[model samples]
Target: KTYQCQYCELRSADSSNLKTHIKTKHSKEK
Candidate 1:
């Protein structure tokens, strides 16, 4: 699977890493 960010084209090999990216980079909550 091609895991990519919706806001950016940042790709990852693993979904877990992608999820972390989403939380770290895209998340608005604390």
Candidate 2:
């Protein structure tokens, strides 16, 4: 019922959190 991360098993209720999750958790540089 929310934005699902394509890179991993995670979901965010808001786009802001989703973007943060992807950037911090899924980013290659991090």
Candidate 3:
């Protein structure tokens, strides 16, 4: 499986993008 967001139903083919998504989407979720 590819990189998927832990906080949402989003998927990324690259690890860098996934990390960026988490920081942008879930950073405040913490």
- Runs of candidate 1 with Cα error greater than 4 angstroms are 28-30
Residue by residue across 1-30, what tens digits does model 3's lDDT show? 687778888998878778888887789567
In model 1, how large is the Cα lDDT of residue 30? 64
The CA lDDT of each predicted structure is 0.82, 0.81, 0.82
Worst 10 residues of 2 by lDDT: 21-30
Query: Which candidate, 1 or 2, would have the higher lDDT against the true structure?
Result: 1
* RMSD to truth, every model: 1.9, 1.9, 2.0
lDDT of 1 by residue, 1-30 (tens): 777788788999878788888888888576
TM-score per model over all chains: 0.59, 0.63, 0.63
Query: Model 1 misses residue 24 by how many Å?
Result: 1.1
Encode model 2's per-residue lDDT on 1-30: one tens digit a residue: 677887897987878778888887889576
Task: Kindly give the stretch of ten consecutive residues in candidate 3 with the minimal lDDT sum.
Answer: 21-30
